[PDB]
């Protein structure tokens, strides 16, 4: 558990991607989660409703994923700014700052 901080970031990114692909298998109240099944099984007047349900579900999933990625990117940017500060003040000089 020495390198847990990097491993948490890798695991969170992989888990977010995995959940994003798993969201494609959900129909979100439509008859099926596959677009091709809807195009082959229904006429366009009802098919537009079914793809509308799938589009709004997948768009909500993608927006949720992008929002989580933005928050994690902000956290990683803060950590990277801290790491750059440590590189400047601990490696390139001697720091009087305690701890």
């Amino acid at each position: 558990s020495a390198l847990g901080k990097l491993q948490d970031v890798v695991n969170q990114n992989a888990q977010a991607l995995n959940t994003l692909v798993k969201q494609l298998s959900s129909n979100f109240g439509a008859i099926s989660s596959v677009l091709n099944d809807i195009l082959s099984r229904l006429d366009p007047p009802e098919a537009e409703v079914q793809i509308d349900r799938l589009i709004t579900g997948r768009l909500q999933s993608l927006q949720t994923y992008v929002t989580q990625q933005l928050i994690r990117a902000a956290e990683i940017r803060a950590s990277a700014n801290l790491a750059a500060t440590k590189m400047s003040e601990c490696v390139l000089g001697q720091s009087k700052r305690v701890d």
Binding site: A2, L3, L6, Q7, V10, L17, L20, V21, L24, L35, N36, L39, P44, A47, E48, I51, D52, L54, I55, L59, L62, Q63, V66, Q69, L70, A73, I76, R77, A80, N81, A83, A84, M87, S88, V91, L92, G93, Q94
Partner: protein
């Protein structure tokens, strides 16, 4: 690949452009983060061939010439200890160049102290 789906999706506007722009911003931000952390010197410093540092040993942190990745034993241990429209963009700085940047910083802080961080 459904053209009817894309025709219906165009009715919702520029959501996809917004999401692509946000992901592109995150992707360039990661490269900016690596650039800010590791590329703090524009000179690639090198250690002398003779490691006479008054009894101080840096072999565990200096790069290993025997290894093809040119990494330190500690860095090699660290790399060993870490294990549908989706694409993964490679980072701008490879692990060899980040290792080279750390090697340059180590050579500067060993041979020159803090002087390389403030000037020549």
């Amino acid at each position: 690949d459904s053209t009817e789906c894309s025709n219906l999706l165009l009715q919702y506007g520029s959501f996809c452009t917004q999401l692509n722009r946000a992901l592109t911003g995150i992707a360039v931000e990661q490269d900016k983060n690596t650039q800010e952390v590791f590329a703090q010197v524009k000179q690639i410093y090198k250690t002398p061939p003779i490691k006479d540092f008054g009894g101080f040993n840096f072999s565990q942190i200096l790069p290993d010439p025997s290894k093809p990745s040119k990494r330190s034993p500690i860095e090699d241990l660290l790399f060993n200890k870490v294990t549908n429209g989706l694409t993964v963009l490679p980072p701008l700085l490879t692990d060899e160049m980040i290792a080279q940047y750390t090697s340059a910083l180590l050579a500067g802080t060993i041979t020159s102290g803090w002087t390389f961080g403030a000037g020549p």
